[PDB]
């Protein structure tokens, strides 16, 4: 059933003059200067002012369309700049030497050295986003195709923005339509996810597979036929993998083995291009198609059959759980914040899997050996992936203060988690400290025995070994599966577990990443910093309503700065300060993951292979006996590999060296806000608003200090911007030079 209100709010520019018209206290006017910061925080905080569960949902359904628009604007910005201001057509002629370049700089006051000698006949900034290998995978040959996508995106950008107008200002849906989660999962698995990969199978077979099989032979970008010509001409396509002469007729008599030529299970790297065989990804997305379509006929709708989720959670209850999942379906239909937290966790955690599965199984042609790009899609999606988990911890806490109800949730699983929340945290507290001693303290042991000249006493490979036997048995059994347990696979799932090396050009696409004592030592640091980031974020969710210290933390709101200096001091008791605290730990958690990844590849995995057959890597296998101490981590990774970012002056990398200093600046600026407090900086306004009153021009909006949380929030927002953009500039001006 689809029930609608027709035009609840019309098209007026009249409310645009009143900022804070959505709210109550801010639709009256500012009296201090914090009212700007009081405004600009709680704009898109939709249940802060709105009480109507139906109307608060209609805003969210509209605003997603606008967020769907701004990606499409941004996508067209990639697709438009890919045609005019790129060396893309030249790059398809030669994928090995010429670097992917877009964002050409205007010829002005000195930034015209950033349009360096990149290749082709071109001058621009060498980019590392991999759109060139995403358009070479998509089958794009001419530069006209990149143009028509951009307008083709821009019309979808405009169509999405009109649809957000159409569904709130014109046709607002109701809450009984919103709460139909079972029909929503049926379509989102069926339409979006089932027909997602099926349509991409519908692209990749008829479009990508011919023109990318030809470019492996590499006849010419111009001499490859246009993508519509492989549907018109029946003879032209069936020259290669000749099953199209049989048509859809093996597909319609269930004799599917006649498509063993384009819909296959090759399973390796395409040795000319270093990427995944696009035949497999056609069979992948076809198997993903049928798996998701039959996943979408599962939930109950208005045709009687199906699983209904209020029936499944009930009678999933055991003796160690009491009521089990009674009422947990009633949470996720009644609270957007509980939905956003779970939607965020498996969205960021998903993207870290994308970062892991893209460097070890490179999906794209000439993305693997282009070390400028194969690094930068790991470390970007890892970085996105940690920020969403911190957002998953935030809205989980916001559910606890404002949306969680102990009336409905008696003796079920949110009740029994909250009723043992010390046993969770204190055992989590122990395993945090246990992990810090037995991972980081194994470096301080390793620091000292090298400083004291006792390398028989450190933890190394030629020393007291800490062998990762579980990660070597898993790396063994996955590398000996093509033929035993995966027979129809030709080679393994990846060459990262085991097998021979592969080269494209003169550079290595993939080789088995080995795990010794130095890899055991770093993998527990990851396990340590993830458990602390859990511990900060988990404690924020669990103690969000009350604790032993404050019994009404639920009354003081999600985001309140302190309860004052009482009880010895209660500075940062709120759940928001836990999300504020976990942000640096997620900064600490991920930046060592990147430091593990970007150093392990350069010394052990990436590098230049001889035409004799052996590989000389970039930083030269130093990760074995150098990475076990901090001084080796400082010298041989941080000090040594930053030699190209501070020597970037006078070259086309010179914008990176400014940012490597420019992010060192902002990171220092953030320390001013975290280390200080409000009641100092307020009283410096009092002497200064004295002076602006002194010369008879004082602002009627009287200035005040920033709020303590805004002092906290600007201290972390400049910390991350100062810290990640340092790593952003370091990782760029390292791997553009040596790769």
């Amino acid at each position: 059933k689809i029930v609608i209100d027709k035009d609840p709010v019309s098209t007026s520019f009249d409310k645009w003059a009143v900022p804070g018209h959505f709210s109550r206290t801010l639709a009256k006017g500012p009296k201090t200067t914090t009212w700007i910061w009081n405004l600009h925080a709680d704009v898109h905080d939709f249940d802060s002012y709105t009480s109507d569960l139906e109307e608060v949902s209609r805003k969210i359904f509209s605003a997603h369309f606008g967020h769907l628009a701004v990606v499409f604007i941004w996508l067209s910005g990639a697709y438009f700049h890919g045609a005019r201001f790129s060396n893309y057509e030249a790059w398809l002629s030669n994928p090995t030497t010429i670097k992917p370049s877009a964002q050409v700089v205007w010829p002005i006051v000195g930034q015209e050295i950033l349009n360096g000698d990149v290749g082709g006949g071109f001058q621009g900034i060498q980019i590392t986003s991999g759109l060139f290998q995403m358009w070479r995978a998509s089958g794009i040959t001419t530069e006209l195709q990149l143009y028509v996508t951009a307008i083709g995106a821009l019309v979808m950008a405009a169509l999405m923005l009109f649809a957000g107008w159409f569904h709130y200002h014109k046709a607002a849906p109701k809450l009984e339509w919103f709460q139909n989660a079972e029909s929503m999962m049926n379509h989102h698995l069926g339409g979006l996810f089932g027909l997602g990969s099926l349509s991409w199978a519908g692209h990749q077979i008829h479009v990508s597979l011919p023109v990318n099989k030809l470019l492996d032979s590499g006849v010419s970008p111009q001499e490859i036929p246009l993508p519509h010509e492989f549907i018109l001409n029946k003879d032209l396509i069936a020259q290669l993998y000749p099953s199209f002469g049989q048509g859809l007729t093996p597909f319609f008599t269930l004799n599917w083995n006649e498509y063993s030529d384009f819909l296959t299970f090759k399973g390796g790297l395409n040795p000319v291009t270093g990427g995944l065989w696009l035949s497999d990804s056609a069979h992948h997305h076809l198997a993903i198609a049928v798996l998701f379509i039959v996943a979408g006929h599962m939930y109950r709708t208005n045709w009687g059959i199906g699983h209904s989720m209020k029936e499944m959670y009930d009678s999933h209850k055991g003796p160690f759980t009491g009521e089990g999942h009674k009422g947990v379906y009633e949470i996720f239909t009644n609270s957007w914040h509980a939905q956003l937290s779970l939607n965020l966790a498996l969205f960021g955690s998903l993207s870290i899997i994308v970062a892991h599965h893209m460097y070890s199984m490179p999906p794209y042609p000439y993305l693997a050996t282009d070390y400028a790009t194969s690094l930068c899609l790991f470390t970007h999606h890892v970085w996105i992936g940690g920020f969403l988990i911190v957002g998953a911890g935030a809205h989980a806490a916001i559910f606890m203060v404002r949306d969680y109800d102990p009336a409905q949730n008696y003796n079920n699983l949110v009740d029994r988690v909250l009723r043992h929340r010390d046993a969770i945290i204190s055992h989590l507290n122990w395993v945090c400290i246990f992990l810090g001693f037995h991972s980081f303290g194994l470096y301080i042991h390793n620091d000292t025995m090298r400083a004291l000249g006792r390398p028989q006493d450190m933890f190394s490979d030629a020393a007291i070994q800490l062998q990762p036997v579980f990660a070597q048995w898993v790396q063994g059994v996955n590398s000996a599966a093509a033929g035993n347990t995966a027979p129809n696979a030709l080679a393994n799932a990846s060459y990262a577990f085991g097998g021979d090396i592969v080269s494209v050009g003169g550079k290595v696409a993939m080789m088995p990443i080995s795990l010794g004592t130095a890899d055991f030592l770093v993998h527990h640091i990851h396990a340590f910093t993830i458990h602390v980031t859990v511990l900060i974020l988990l404690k924020g969710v669990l103690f969000a309503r009350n604790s032993r210290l404050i019994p009404d933390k639920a009354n003081l709101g999600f985001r309140f700065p302190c309860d004052g200096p009482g009880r010895g001091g209660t500075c940062q008791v709120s759940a928001w300060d836990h999300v504020f605290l976990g942000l640096f730990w997620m900064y600490n958690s991920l930046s060592v993951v990147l430091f593990h990844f970007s150093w392990k590849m350069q010394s052990d995995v990436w590098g230049n292979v001889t035409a004799d057959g052996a590989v000389s890597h970039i930083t030269g296998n130093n990760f074995a006996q150098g990475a076990i101490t901090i001084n080796g981590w400082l010298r041989d990774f941080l000090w040594a590999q930053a030699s190209q970012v501070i020597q970037s002056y006078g070259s086309a990398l010179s914008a990176y060296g400014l940012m490597f200093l420019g992010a060192h600046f902002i990171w220092a600026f953030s320390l001013m806000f975290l280390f200080s407090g409000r009641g100092y900086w307020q009283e410096l306004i009092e002497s200064i608003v004295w002076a602006h009153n002194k010369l008879k021009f004082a602002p009627s909006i009287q200035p005040r200090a920033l709020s303590i949380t805004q002092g906290r929030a600007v201290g972390v927002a400049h910390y991350l911007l100062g810290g990640i953009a340092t790593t952003w500039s370091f990782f760029h001006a390292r791997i553009i030079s040596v790769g």
């Binding site: 032993r548 210290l549 009404d552 309860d563 004052g564 200096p565 009482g566 009880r567 010895g568 209660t570």
Partner: protein, 80 residues
């Protein structure tokens, strides 16, 4: 324990009394008019110094003031 003083600028609004999380304060009859009321702190041994009280006095400069003093088990809010 903390010291809680109540100054003579109290306007008997009762906001402070209803802000204390441990019930340290109460309103008492005032004799300057025999119609208004002033706040009192008969149980300062339970004051934790949270300062929620002072955040409730409307007057431009507090009628109730919390001066942190000797700390104790009760004032530190220990359940242990």
């Amino acid at each position: 324990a903390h010291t809680v003083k109540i100054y003579d600028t109290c306007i008997g609004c009762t906001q402070c009394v209803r802000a204390c999380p441990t019930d340290v304060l109460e309103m008492v009859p005032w004799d300057g008019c025999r119609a208004n009321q002033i706040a009192s702190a008969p149980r300062t041994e339970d004051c934790v110094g949270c300062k929620r009280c002072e955040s409730a006095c409307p007057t431009d400069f507090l009628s109730i003031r919390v001066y942190l003093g000797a700390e104790t088990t009760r004032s530190m809010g220990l359940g242990y």
